[PDB]
Amino acid sequence: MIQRTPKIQVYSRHPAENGKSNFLNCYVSGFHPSDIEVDLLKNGERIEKVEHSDLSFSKDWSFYLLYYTEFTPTEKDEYACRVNHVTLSQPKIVKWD
Ligand code: NA
Numbered sequence: 001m002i003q004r005t006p007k008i009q010v011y012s013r014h015p016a017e018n019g020k021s022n023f024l025n026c027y028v029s030g031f032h033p034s035d036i037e038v039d040l041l042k043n044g045e046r047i048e049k050v051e052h053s054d055l056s057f058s059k060d061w062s063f064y065l066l067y068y069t070e071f072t073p074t075e076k077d078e079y080a081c082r083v084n085h086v087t088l089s090q091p092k093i094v095k096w097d
Pocket of ligand 1: 084
């Protein structure tokens with residue numbers, strides 16, 4: 001068996017074909033096992049509506065998840081990604097910078 005803690009990166013992106021749109025992204029990479037729970041947060045509250053969740057694997061024991069959705073951030077709101085995995089004794093929260 002093998003278990004690897006996921007790398008977690010939170011960032012925003014504007015699709016070039018529609019610059020006005022902004023998307024909040026949580027890229028969870030290189031983890032194993034595949035079982036996982038991931039949420040985007042807005043001011044500590046779970047965002048129920050997340051339009052995209054793309055899962056893939058490279059080696060049979062390495063998974064990747066891109067979890068993102070459109071959003072409209074303001075200088076007053078705080079965004080983050082919360083991840084729960086067997087390798088994390090406590091859920092890991094990575095804030096969006
Ligand atoms: Na855990």
